[model samples]
Target: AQYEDGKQYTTLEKPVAGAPQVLEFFSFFCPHCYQFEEVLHISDNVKKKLPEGVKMTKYHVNFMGGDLGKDLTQAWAVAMALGVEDKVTVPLFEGVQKTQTIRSASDIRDVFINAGIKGEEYDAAWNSFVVKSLVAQQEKAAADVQLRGVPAMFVNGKYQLNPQGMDTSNMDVFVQQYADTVKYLSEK
Candidate 1:
């Protein structure tokens, strides 16, 4: 794979089975994660550069925001279920990390409401089977990965990308290398 184990990436002992998959674990309350998504647009760039059929999925971690963490994760799942992630992602990040305005579930729901999602629609999706299932899976994944930090990426559910070991002196080079490593790992 060329990428060094425990350096460029790490191989999971109990790998989850899913080739061609990039799973990201992040939190809205994390400043670095906010930068990764909003400023550098790392996840977006990686998704665009991934090979066809390679799926990129984000799981909002529940380790931050204390009691509100799970709520935020559920809110994120709701946005995904309603196909409004593009609309709510930045706003949620801005509210939680930048503006420091989102502190409760209702406040989080307001972000969706402002994104053109009906209040009733948000309520329904909050309790919908799909959203519930996704939230459960996200919780399970958070534990399964034994995640210790935010803005973590896993390729094919087996390899963990090491951002610290990557060349980040330039944004373009970093993104390209990140995508290339992910592509290589996906085929492993």
Candidate 2:
């Protein structure tokens, strides 16, 4: 299942410095992204294998305007700014994909409200200028990347890889595939 250099990941002209960065680009509205959560949540073992100094992050990508994707993208940026991602991220995904109960910003904010956040706190975070700025920044990144698809990953800002970019499309092996790509990029 090892991926060849040009076939799976494309190296950048210049490499990054310090710790290698791994970022997953996704949105709550994408069903494929929802499914990829299975691999992410599959086991802690998948993450423990990372080489030292590798940092991983997940960012929301919004290419579809006027749809729930835009709203959810804003919601994610707010969640990060509020420092409530650890508490509400999973349930938000479940609320959107499993229960089909999340549609707008109000519903998404309620997930945090229900998780012991006060209304004022939620409102402040949801409306904060910081949240708005982060949303603009993240959305602009999406606009610049020319992304191939959702649930994609960028490693060390030097390599872009995903299931479609890999040799196989089997969902079952994606977690390991991602881990393999991370290991390879980290060593470079």
Candidate 3:
């Protein structure tokens, strides 16, 4: 089912047990998500130290409307479809920030090809069942929250929507601040 705004709900809204649940609401078109590159890398460095089964997940946001959103929605899916996340995810950050390029389905597919994934293979992965499921949830998160900007976050479903708190924008500072906030608050 497609998302219906206002009436729609974001986040799992379900109670997670045991260790605390965490999730990062991100965007393919957001420069802020790019800024967190170092932070995510730090995640790898200390991954084993943190709680296992992190329950920490990321949700992608859409910048442009309609097909533009749909196309952007597919960027993460395409990578997940191929099971080659690092190749495309890193490049996506570069394309969007360093070159200010947001991904189209074609461009995303091309990256997979250049990385040795065949064209039809890439297309199949893009259209895979797993990809479709992710797309639906991504859309639902945005609709229910009425999201309007980049790099938002929810911790146990409590978070700042745009970092600005007033629909304001900050580049690196906002994202880092939010990341730290999630860490600090989750512990309490």
Candidate 4:
């Protein structure tokens, strides 16, 4: 691999211990993250190239939506619990970023409702202990890393990616280099 410390990635002082997983910290309110998802489809593309048994976990940052940040993160967890993230992620992003229709928790709830999750079921998952705990874990995880930006990627809980270090002149090259770097770090 052509990656190097500081340029391609920054090694964590204390690496997070767990099974090999790619952690992505982002916020729906971030335009760059929106582009990363809608424009580049980075997650879906990179996911296809990741080694088997290596899964990607998204952690919604709590600093972007102000008081609404927690609500968004909880909604994300609820979607996960309901096994409807595929149906919810882009809608949430569009509502929050493009349409500007989602201004409150109820609006978020409506998005879930629109995605085919029943209102009662949405309420159940929203307030469930599992989703709440997942929200809390995401908050702490972002804080622990002192994450200052959106669309950040960490491999195996370490190795923060530096996009500037890769060949990002175009989407294809960028995704290829990113997947290559992630593959390299996942095994480090």
Candidate 5:
């Protein structure tokens, strides 16, 4: 059903329960999604005013039709598995999209180590079997969600919210729509 503005948030056949989830399927190499990184980080709370019980998670998409997509997907899965996702998120984007320095595993590792991550932890997280598995899972997830492009959002694992009619160019307006969508979905 259409949530608002005559645009429909695609409903899932089986939605996750217990609490609401706001999942972003994105790619660091995506120039458009880069604008969304401003509010996507956990530490960058400027646009993070979601309601209670609402959790936001990001799944790095590896299907951006580039090698950087796969490399960064693994890089991000490693960060999230190591519990330092908040630390590397913005820097990862800046390093890749702005400085054009992080393009390989070694570069990604260097970025993590330069961020003050312990060398031992870096090795463990980067090479961990769990991290590799998560990267694979992210790839499968993108296909499962039928992702069309970066900056895709799924609310409570049920609604595929679209940014078409919303102010996709403005961060605050888009954020408000997300919050409002969650609220509207939760009440139902």
Candidate 6:
């Protein structure tokens, strides 16, 4: 599967494209990303009201210097291509938040396996272009989207709503605010 930005983001094709898009820019190893998990779990509610086709997604950033970039990018895109996107993102973070086990290749593999990601499909999905391309496109999205931090939020590939925007460290309050912002965005 070749990488195609437009196709991968086809969820944006619906009339509700501007629906608030929350992209969690995180690393399995980053303590801050783990610390942010309490607020992050509320996203299930955010997903529930996202106007049918509108959606949220995660971008597992490459934080282990350059070594894990390719692997993480592959993990994300391939997981989606395999239809394990939600399965992988949700609980994996809980593990990272609770255990802080971020480490080497096997460490990540164990995380995926424990998250109910079938190893066979996981391996195959990682090789799939659908997922790989999805991940490869993230850097472009981050650049064009003007994202410079993890757990950054974007809407319609345009607006940025974050702590920096509010000038506060209350991420819990920030997420609730984001939900309200999303409520307003959905009406448009």
Pairs with steric clashes in candidate 6? 25-151, 77-131, 78-131
| Model 1: how far residue 184 lies from native, Å | 1.7
By TM-score, how accurate is candidate 6?
0.68
Residue-pair clashes per prediction, in order, are: 0, 0, 0, 0, 0, 3
Residue 154, candidate 1: alpha-carbon lDDT: 89
State model 4's lDDT.
Answer: 0.85
TM-score on alpha carbons, each prediction: 0.93, 0.81, 0.66, 0.93, 0.81, 0.68
- Tens-digit lDDT track of model 4 for 106-187: 9999998898999989998888999989888888778767788988998877788888787767888887787777878877
User: Comparing 2 and 4 by lDDT, which wins?
Assistant: 4
Candidate 1 local Cα displacement, residue 166, angstroms: 1.3
Return the top candidate by TM-score.
4
Off by over 4 Å in 1: 18-20
Candidate 5, superposed: residue stretches over 4 Å from native: 5-8, 12-20, 39-49, 168-171
lDDT of each: 0.85, 0.70, 0.56, 0.85, 0.71, 0.57
Q: Tens-digit lDDT track for model 1 on 51-135?
A: 7776678889888988788899999899888888889999999998889899899999999998899999999999899998989
Tens digit per residue, CA lDDT, model 6, 49-106: 5676666766766643367545666676766676666666645555445665644556
State the lDDT of candidate 3 residue by residue for 38-142, as single tens digits. 444423332333345555556666664456456766767666556677777777666655775544667656666777878887777677888888787777766
TM-score computed on alpha carbons, candidate 1: 0.93
lDDT of 2 at 62: 69
The reply for model 4, stretches above 4 Å from the true place, is none
* Candidate 2 residue lDDT tens string, 26-98: 8786777766674455223336767766567777876643577787887888778877777887788889878
Error of 1 at 78 (Å): 0.5
Q: How many backbone clashes does candidate 6 have?
A: 3
Worst window of 10 by summed lDDT in candidate 4: 14-23
| Residue-level lDDT tens digits of model 5 in 22-44 | 67787888876777666443213
